[PDB]
Amino acid sequence: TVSRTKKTVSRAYGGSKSANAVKERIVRAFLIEEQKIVKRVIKEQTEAAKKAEKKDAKK
Amino acid sequence: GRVIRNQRKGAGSIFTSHTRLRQGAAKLRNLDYAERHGYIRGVVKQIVHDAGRGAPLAKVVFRDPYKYKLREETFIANEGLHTGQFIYAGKKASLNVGNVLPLGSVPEGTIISNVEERPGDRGALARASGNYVIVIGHNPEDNKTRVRLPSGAKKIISSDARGVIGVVAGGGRIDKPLLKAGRAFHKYRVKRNSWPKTRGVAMNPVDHPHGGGNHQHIGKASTISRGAVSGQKAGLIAARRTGLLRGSQ
Amino acid sequence: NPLTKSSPRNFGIGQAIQPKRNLSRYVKWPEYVRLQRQKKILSIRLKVPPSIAQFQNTLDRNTAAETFKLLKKYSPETAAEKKERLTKEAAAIAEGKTKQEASPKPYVVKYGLNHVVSLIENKKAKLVLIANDVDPIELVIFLPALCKKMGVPYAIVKGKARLGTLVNQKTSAVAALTEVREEDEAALAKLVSTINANYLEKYEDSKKHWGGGIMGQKAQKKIEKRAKAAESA
Amino acid sequence: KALKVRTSASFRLPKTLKLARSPKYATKAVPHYNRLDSYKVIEQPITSETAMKKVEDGNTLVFKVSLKANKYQIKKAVKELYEVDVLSVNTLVRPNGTKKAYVRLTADFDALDIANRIGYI
RNA sequence: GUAUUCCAGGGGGCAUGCCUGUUUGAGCGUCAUU
RNA sequence: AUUCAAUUAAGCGGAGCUGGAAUUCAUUUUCCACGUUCUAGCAUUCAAAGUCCUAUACGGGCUGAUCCGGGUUGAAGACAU
RNA sequence: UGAAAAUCCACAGGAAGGAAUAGUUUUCAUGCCAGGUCGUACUGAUAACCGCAGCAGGUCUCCAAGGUGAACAGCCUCUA
RNA sequence: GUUUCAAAGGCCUAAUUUUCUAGGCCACCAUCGAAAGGGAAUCCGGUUAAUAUUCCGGAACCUGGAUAUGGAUUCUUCAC
Lengths: 59, 249, 233, 121
Hints:
By secondary structure, chain A is mostly helical. Chain A is built from 2 helices and no strands.
């Protein structure tokens, strides 16, 4: 029977995780998503090129 | 005479385990699809001291493939693990310290612990402090690897059975002497009621076979047969050798 | 088109929660369901004797339909039609006094096991129809051997329920004919000659051969694979 | 043929049409009259020398109450019999094994005037 | 007492095993019909 | 049959795709692989595609997730009990 | 390496629901009604308990002043 | 023996506005066990031959019900 302004602070994860915890996991969540899109860039370029490279072995 | 201490431990009134500060049954994950074929990610969050156990435990968080949920499993920590570390369990999992592999996808001369006797046993062989199982041999016909247990006696185990890589943590526990008797008390205080053991020869002839007589002597041979009965078996049971052994065990 | 976006899920072992599949194969049934399904299998795997094996030789779909078209004629009275007949009886007896010829002579199919066995024993029954799924087989197993000795046409047929439907019953077990009208005698003898080819003529043949000894799917592919590698290497 | 599609690997009891009661004869025959009446709850007015001192000063009249009597029931009983609006009820069980109910009335009704009407004073 | 849901008061009900029937059902255990 | 173990009885056994290829050369002839490994994030109410309609509001069928046998799976076995 | 569960709260998540001639909020300010049942005296010991009894025995706890002195030691006072 | 080789259920919203029917989700499981463990919320002053955090006077607080006034929020909106 207390107001929830006293229970919580106004931020993302609020009254559960600390501010420096939210600091890091935003930086992680962002930076991993940048690395995950490069997994396409490496494979799409190489695996498509592998079909050209493997055909040279037959000729 | 009376029922001897030997005989009356199996009743289980006082002679029972003290499971107050015991964390949980230290076991492996269940089998099937995910770890049969591929592998799964797991994150070690805590490394805990279990009460009355020479082994620091580890609690790893895995996902449920069929639900939006999380199931924690209590692993025995091998010396090398740390909190905030990834673990890889399955057939296709790689060979590192902590990772759980089946015996078939492992080369000869490797080191492991918490090994299953069957597949789906959830652990049995080599769970104590500073112990580890070594893989020797292999077979194509009959999925059955050759394995050496830490006592010395070798054993044939199925190839699909599991084993966590590395030596079990908390090693060199036996090296320090206990000194004062109060240190020994606190060891058995968090296990069973098996300590202050009186010598059977000091007792009366009613309470124990060796007991009785004007001088404290046994009287007859302490080497007792395998084909005996409960009450008689107090001494060396089915002994091949006696006396001081030299070097080779 | 513009604001809409595609999003593939990927169910590659570790990635994503798996979708809803039909797991009808992996359901834990009740104990009574597991009993009746395993009782089917236990009889098939063991070698069944020739006396039990002959009930598998059932009447085919095309021939059977003609038989029950015949036997739905010469069916017994419904409870209302018996009450109709007894009112006619009471009228003629009071004013007339005539039993034995009045309310004609009924032509009707014979049923009941103890009732039918006596007709076969005195060479009276022309056609007989035996059920394939009686609870103890001991009840109905000896009837094929009895009809052989006396030279009576007989035919095993599916559904003890279907024999019950033509006689106002839940289950009948057996159903035989004796008396029949002269108009429908031509069609009856046509069925007997068709029946005797399968059942009565092949009694000495059916007595010899054993049934059973049929393995499950995992056992079949194990034997076929093992036979291929060693012999045809 | 064509099986019922089912996602779960469990098999539970299918809920069925649960039918209600509809008897051919009554078990009781005659419904019983009121077990606890207005007159049966409040039995006697207590006339000890201490109780006279409370009636004058405290504006509170005291009763000997039967066992199996709630403070809801005693509030209803005094309200019905003597036609008075009750403020509060306090109850205790005596050492001899009989319940006693202290009852305080509102400021409108004087406890001394109603006391001389009932019998005692 | 402002009341399908909250509070109190007066009255009537809710155990287990087994039998006979009634109504809903479960199972490619199995039969005929589209 | 009897015995032992595990799960809320999910992915058993065999064929088929695309495989990528295989070298007697593309094959009704076999081997051979299957979507995640710098980081203590995140993953749930079933979406795109085509097909029609509910008259396009809000949503129905077929795919996305292949098909066929309903033996839950693995020991052990005419020994043991 | 020094209990468990009832119980209460917070966050992620976006289900469903809403306006202007009117509508949402009862985790805030005020205001209204109700709160059952049983225990409640006194003793707790050189006299209310157990020990044949008003028996130098035995029986779990809390509060705790001044001076001397290391001191909850011994010896002497105040309140009761 | 107490979760097992059992077909082991009780929690929310409408539909219907006869108050009886429809939506749904979710699922190895009785019940007893502490007046020193856990635990919703009360204090001062007065009064009796003998009772009080329990009666009287004065000032508070919690849980469960009902509910309407003020304030806040709203042209792009669930505050800055």
